Write a protein that binds this ligand. Sequence first.
Ligand SMILES: CC(=O)Nc1ccccc1O
Ligand SMILES: [Cl-]
Ligand SMILES: [Cl-]
Length: 182
Amino acid sequence: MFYGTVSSPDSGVYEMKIGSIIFQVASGDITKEEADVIVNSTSNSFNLKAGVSKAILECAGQNVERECSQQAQQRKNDYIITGGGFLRCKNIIHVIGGNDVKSSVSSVLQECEKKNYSSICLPAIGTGNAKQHPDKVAEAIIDAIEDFVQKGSAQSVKKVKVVIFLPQVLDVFYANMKKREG
Ligand SMILES: CC(=O)Nc1ccccc1O
Ligand SMILES: [Cl-]
Ligand SMILES: [Cl-]
């Protein structure tokens, strides 16, 4: 059930179908990507600037930084949605790196359906400052997408891409895809 075949459409990029969704992984700088939503993996204060969060907040700009701290003071949030600033996206969804990764990805998918968005790009959530294990993170991200497909929830969402800072973490994601393939 659900899983297609792993192939490489471009050097260093690997993909497979999960239901109707194209799931892709690659190594690189996520701030150079274009997608409807880019995901940030941050602290429970939404003001971290270390690792992926440093690159995202510096490239998005000061207006996005201020939107984050404004929402953080308003209520207790599991995640926040801001504009894209100077990134090539419509919105940034800022998730907490130390939280359950399957839950965080499920929330991102649901928010993207609510906006009728088609494409998402995320980092290896939790593997930076939060120091979650890469094998557990890969299993959680792919499980969230499988659950979303099984429930019949994929309508607008067509492409989910993980852009991963360390090539060694990319290798862990690729092995998990091969374990699942049809
Ligand atoms: C998960 C995470 O923070 N990754 C990352 C991305 C870019 C630079 C440094 C990094 O550690
Ligand atoms: Cl993290
Ligand atoms: Cl990453």
